[PDB]
Amino acid sequence: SSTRNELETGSSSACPKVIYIFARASTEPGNMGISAGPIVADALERIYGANDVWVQGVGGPYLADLASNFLPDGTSSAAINEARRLFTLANTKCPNAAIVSGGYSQGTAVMAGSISGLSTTIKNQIKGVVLFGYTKNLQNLGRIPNFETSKTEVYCDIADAVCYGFLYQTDAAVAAPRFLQARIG
């Protein structure tokens, strides 16, 4: 459940309802990690059908190392390009799937940096984005640059220091799936 590649591996003859793309926290294993990621993946699969959700982690060159949190974008440029690559693949393979996405900690910076740079038509296919412990919360004014704020939800705990420039279990299991579901329609 730490590694999910249903989008890379998916065929455009079998497009699902939902494509879910997740960027993990620093240090987490796989491309999904072991906290926020799998929890949102399971909630979505419960709502829509395991067969009607493609779950996809941002792996490849997104190494999730701590040092990269200090780069100007809060992550590496290769992690950002890999998330872009993946959203782009979702749109080429399945232009009608609802794309939803999530990030936890540094993955939050992968989500904000990739989405802010994508085309109008790709961003339109992204129906919802959930950010858990958003490391660029203050810098980005609680939103993703160039992406509609009604589609964005930030879970930023009062005691979460990264939010001022595992605390999110009920956010991930309960509040995030509902937010996403309200917009997948």
Ligand SMILES: O=C(CSCCc1ccccc1)C(F)(F)F
């Ligand atoms: O991916 C995240 C990166 S933010 C961690 C960097 C940091 C945390 C607390 C205090 C100083 C620096 C995390 F590692 F999951 F938290």
